Amino acid sequence: TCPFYKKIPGTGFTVDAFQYGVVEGCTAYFLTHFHSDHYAGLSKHFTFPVYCSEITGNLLKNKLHVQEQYIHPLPLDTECIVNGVKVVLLDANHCPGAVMILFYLPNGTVILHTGDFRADPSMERSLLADQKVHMLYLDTTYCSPEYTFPSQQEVIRFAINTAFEAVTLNPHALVVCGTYSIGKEKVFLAIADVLGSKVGMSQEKYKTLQCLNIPEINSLITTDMCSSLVHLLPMMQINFKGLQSHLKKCGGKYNQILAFRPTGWTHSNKFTRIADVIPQTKGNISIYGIPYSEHSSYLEMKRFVQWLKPQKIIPTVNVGTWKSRSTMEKYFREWKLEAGY
Ligand code: NI
């Protein structure tokens, strides 16, 4: 049955709640972003209103075949009225088309649902700064102090310099990047840009990327693998077996693979600096795991919440164990006592 943390009190609304069948008394279904744990249950047979960003609405129509008449795309940073309730969509700094939702309840409560997000100081200068928020439904994916990672910029710098060095030393090396959902496009696009190549990929992934309003995208991507030296493959294929196989398929155009696996967190982060990351190598195949995150680190999350000073926090991630739930609640209390709210 729909969990309470997917329900907006004082409304008929749910958030990212498409796998429960008909939610009793739900009059509008919001979808924060096009990731499968969040959209699970949507299809062409869905007949209730879905509210989302334009980008998410492009993916609903073209990838899942949801009928146009049930898709209600909203512009960002704009006050809109949904079943008589004022809402605002904000950028979540997650994947393309990912939003946070501000709800202005008839009774005067203000609720922010972060969806999935990577907190950033730039958020402290959106429409959020203009009023107080009573309840925060928070993406707590990495809500423990061991979760530190570098800025997205430092990670991309590492990958561009790595790839450029390797292909300059060996003009017959192939670069491969893994993916399993939208997000992290900067990894492969930045690498192709410094090499003067387009990124080659399957037809289904090219279609997905064409839904995202990325500027000049027809200049960066292609379904012709032969004319490309940066290839995008399913994340599952980013291993020595999968890559040896792929290399065979290129028919002696290439003799070396350099592959990147943008992961979430990995425990080398507590110890290792980005400067200090090394690949795993077998034969003429090297694999780099790089900590390119689109969720908040512990410290980024803490800053955001201490800035916003909500009255009540409802976690949306890691809620399934008592030890997790209890630990998070302890961090929220420290944050509030340290900051004085
Ligand atoms: Ni997500």
Residue 80 phi/psi, 5° resolution?
-125, 155
**Are both 154 and 135 inside the same structural domain?**
no
Pair (212, 106) in one structural domain = no
35 C-alpha to center of ligand 1: Å?
5
Q: 109 alpha carbon to ligand 1 midpoint, in Å?
A: 27
Q: CATH code at 182?
A: 3.40.50.12650
Query: What separation in Å is there between the alpha carbon of 27 and the centre of ligand 1?
Result: 24
d(CA 281, ligand 1 centre) in Å: 30
Q: What's the 117 CA to ligand 1 centre distance in angstroms?
A: 8
Residues 264 and 155 grouped into a single domain? yes
Q: Do residue 222 and residue 116 come from a single domain?
A: no
- Please give the Cα distance from 209 to 207 (Å, whole number): 6
Closest CA to 56 of 36, 42, 73: 73
Compute the distance from residue 10 Cα to the ligand 1 centre, in Å: 26
Distance between Cα 252 and ligand 1 center (Å): 38
CA of 94 to the centre of ligand 1 (A): 7
How far is the centre of ligand 1, averaged over its atoms, from the C-alpha of 332 (Å)?
22
Resolution (A): 1.8
Cα 260 to averaged position of ligand 1 atoms, centre (Å): 20
Method used to solve the structure: X-ray
**Å from CA of 116 to ligand 1 middle:** 5
CATH number at residue 59: 3.60.15.10
Ligand 1 centroid to Cα of residue 333, in Å, is 26
Distance 282 CA to ligand 1 centre (A): 32
Sign of CA dihedral 327, 100, 135, 83: negative
Assess whether 182 and 172 both reside in one domain: yes
Per-residue H/E/C for the chain: CCCHHHEECCCCEEECCCCCCCCCCCCEEECCCCCHHHHCCCCCCCCCCEEECHHHHHHHHHHCCCCHHHEEECCCCCCEEECCEEEEEEECCCCCCCEEEEEECCCCCEEEECCCCCCCHHHHHCHHHHCCCCEEEECCCCCCCCCCCCCHHHHHHHHHHHHHHHHHHCCCEEEEEEECCCCCHHHHHHHHHHHCCCEECCHHHHHHHHCCCCCCHHHCEECCCCCCCEEEEEHHHCCHHHHHHHHHHCCCCCCEEEEEEECCCCCCCCCCCHHHCCCEEECCEEEEEECCCCCCCHHHHHHHHHHHCCCEEEECCCCCCHHHHHHHHHHHHHHHHHHCC
Distance in Å, CA 255 to ligand 1 centroid? 36
Burial class of residue 333, CB neighbours in 10 A (0-12, 13-18, 19+): exposed
Counting the structural domains of the chain, the total is 2
* Residue 315 CA to ligand 1 centre (angstroms): 15
CA 95 – ligand 1 centroid, Å:
7
- Expressed in angstroms and rounded, the spacing between residue 181 Cα and the centre of ligand 1 is 9
12, 140: one domain: yes
Same domain for 303 and 213: no
Cβ-contact 112, 100 below 8 angstroms: yes
The answer on 249 and 153 residing in a single domain is yes
Q: CA 341, CA 336: separation in Å to the nearest integer?
A: 6
Domain boundaries, position 189: 148-295
- The closest of 174, 285, 300 to 239, measured between CA atoms, is 285
Alpha carbon of 263 to ligand 1 centroid (Å): 13
Domain co-membership, 291 together with 172? yes
- 67 and 138 assigned to the same domain: yes
| 139 and 8 part of one domain | yes
Q: Are residues 255 and 307 in the same domain?
A: no
In 3D space, the residue among 101, 69, 84 whose CA is nearest the CA of residue 11 turns out to be 84
